[PDB]
Amino acid sequence: GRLAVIALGGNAIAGPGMDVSVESQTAAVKRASSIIADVLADGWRSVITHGNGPQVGYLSEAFEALPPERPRQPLYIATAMTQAWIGLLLKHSLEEELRRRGLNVLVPVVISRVLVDVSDPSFNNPSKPVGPIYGREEAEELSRRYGWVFKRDPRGGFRRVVPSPRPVSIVDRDLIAEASAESPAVVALGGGGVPVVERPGGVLEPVEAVVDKDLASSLLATQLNADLLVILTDVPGVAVNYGREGERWLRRAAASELKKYLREGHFPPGSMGPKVEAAISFVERTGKPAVIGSLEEARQVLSLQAGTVVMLG
Amino acid sequence: RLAVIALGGNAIAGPGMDVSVESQTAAVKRASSIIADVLADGWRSVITHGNGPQVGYLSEAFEALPPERPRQPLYIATAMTQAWIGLLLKHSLEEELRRRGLNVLVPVVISRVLVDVSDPSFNNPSKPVGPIYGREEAEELSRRYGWVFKRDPRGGFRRVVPSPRPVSIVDRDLIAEASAESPAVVALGGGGVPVVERPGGVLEPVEAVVDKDLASSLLATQLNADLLVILTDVPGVAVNYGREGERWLRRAAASELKKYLREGHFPPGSMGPKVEAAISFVERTGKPAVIGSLEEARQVLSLQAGTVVMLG
Numbered sequence: 001g002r003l004a005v006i007a008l009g010g011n012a013i014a015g016p017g018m019d020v021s022v023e024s025q026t027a028a029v030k031r032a033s034s035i036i037a038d039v040l041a042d043g044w045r046s047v048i049t050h051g052n053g054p055q056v057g058y059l060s061e062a063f064e065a066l067p068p069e070r071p072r073q074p075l076y077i078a079t080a081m082t083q084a085w086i087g088l089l090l091k092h093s094l095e096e097e098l099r100r101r102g103l104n105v106l107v108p109v110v111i112s113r114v115l116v117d118v119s120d121p122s123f124n125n126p127s128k129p130v131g132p133i134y135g136r137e138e139a140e141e142l143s144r145r146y147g148w149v150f151k152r153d154p155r156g157g158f159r160r161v162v163p164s165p166r167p168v169s170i171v172d173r174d175l176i177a178e179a180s181a182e183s184p185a186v187v188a189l190g191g192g193g194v195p196v197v198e199r200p201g202g203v204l205e206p207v208e209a210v211v212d213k214d215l216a217s218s219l220l221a222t223q224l225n226a227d228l229l230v231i232l233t234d235v236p237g238v239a240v241n242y243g244r245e246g247e248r249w250l251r252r253a254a255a256s257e258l259k260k261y262l263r264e265g266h267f268p269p270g271s272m273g274p275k276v277e278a279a280i281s282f283v284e285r286t287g288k289p290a291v292i293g294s295l296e297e298a299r300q301v302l303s304l305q306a307g308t309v310v311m312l313g
Numbered sequence: 314r315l316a317v318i319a320l321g322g323n324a325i326a327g328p329g330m331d332v333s334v335e336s337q338t339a340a341v342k343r344a345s346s347i348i349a350d351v352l353a354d355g356w357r358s359v360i361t362h363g364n365g366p367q368v369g370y371l372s373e374a375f376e377a378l379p380p381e382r383p384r385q386p387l388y389i390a391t392a393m394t395q396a397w398i399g400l401l402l403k404h405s406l407e408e409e410l411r412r413r414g415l416n417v418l419v420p421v422v423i424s425r426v427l428v429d430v431s432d433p434s435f436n437n438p439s440k441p442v443g444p445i446y447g448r449e450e451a452e453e454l455s456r457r458y459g460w461v462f463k464r465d466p467r468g469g470f471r472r473v474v475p476s477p478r479p480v481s482i483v484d485r486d487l488i489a490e491a492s493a494e495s496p497a498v499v500a501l502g503g504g505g506v507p508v509v510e511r512p513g514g515v516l517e518p519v520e521a522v523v524d525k526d527l528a529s530s531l532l533a534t535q536l537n538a539d540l541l542v543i544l545t546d547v548p549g550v551a552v553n554y555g556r557e558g559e560r561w562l563r564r565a566a567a568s569e570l571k572k573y574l575r576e577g578h579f580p581p582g583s584m585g586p587k588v589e590a591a592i593s594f595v596e597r598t599g600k601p602a603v604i605g606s607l608e609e610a611r612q613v614l615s616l617q618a619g620t621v622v623m624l625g
Binding site: 087 | 371373374377382385389403404422423425486490494518
């Protein structure tokens, strides 16, 4: 009855090509739920997290497609929306699967906020694109009016970029822990969580930014005193010389060794880098192993028999 | 004591369906301050709310994209409003409780409600949802999606969807568990995400909305709550609009309200459902139900304001 925080990736929620159509997602989630059911069968208790890239982007585009006079919801509200959207899909599918196996349990979806620091370098150097392509005139206006920041897209137009600060604490950790005590499967920290900052006087205030789901999941695992941090992606694990000549997939590696590779740019900042950073952080802060593997091989990954096991030292 | 408190539109958005974050944050702060007073007074609570303006806004946005872009189903939009409105309520309530000395977290429960596919409403939809469309746009949407529309006095067209009666709250147990851990729980947003039972145990989401008051009354009965509270804009139920007499009923036997209801005194688009919900709670549990104003919530919870419905 050990506890594992399992961080799902895009392949568990959306179809090939980033399709957020209800059809595509329901099929992907069915596959992911079946596999998660296997893991629960092996005796694990879990807190399942997930990303929300295509989904939050879709919502951003939708609100921006409205007539100029209509209000656009802020990014943190869009993020909250994705927690219910993706969360419900996983919740409904997993419950159905467990039921089909004779297990009658309800899967809660915890609306989750993540505390970030206002001093984080990302707030002054936003680089995460979110939403549709903006025209020059509209973008310059948004910058003048709301202080939005943009990056030029080589194919034409501009992309709004927002901060991606590092997670400091999981505000709703206690609700997640309580949910876990009551159910073997809990969905939380969707999209990396809703970012808030502490204002003077103890007041928490939501901010327009995104938080890396892997870094956040690692922090959650540490704060829950989880027995294991699992990152499920679309590759067998971590590899050095990935997609290159001397490519080699690691089966086990000391966090200290991976940290060296990380500092040399061996892991793309847009994919495996954050996952390796997350795994290392978990090992350093808890002293317990973390594993990065394929969603397909999840059952074995959890047993540490597949994927890359990041070890202490 | 456990009270199920059904919040209305004035608690979440601004007049004229103003769903901007500024207007909703302000509205929610006002409602949360009042709810915090209720909790400080000793009550434990499951707080529900509607989502009319919010779910309508989502539909409007999804349809604003080029026709080929994926459109999310109504059940997903409803779920989205639960996190949207839920987050706002949760955030502000926690802040208000903290200032009053209660350092607690407020959970938001994603909630589904079971309905029956044979419900008469499915083939005779009458619940208006979404933005107001023009005649040409509407007929085009009917050909494109098979949607049904209702024309208003001003010539505007609004989509109408089924609003079947709630049968059971699928996530009742999660709501009960949350309530055991926290004095304030937000659940059943918008009346709940509707689903129907199919071959086996399978639950199938359906295109429809459920009345939030009827669903709240059902939840209150299934949680064995001590009180069902419906907070709205009016001080209570009105049956007399003449210069003389009491303005709003202070208390009334279930059978008395039922008679007024059967006479047409309460429009199905407004007070009708609230009265039906209060009557149902009283008949099923024998405990009192009250319909009052959000402003006077503190007196309402105590049954010293609003219309108190009693068994009889």
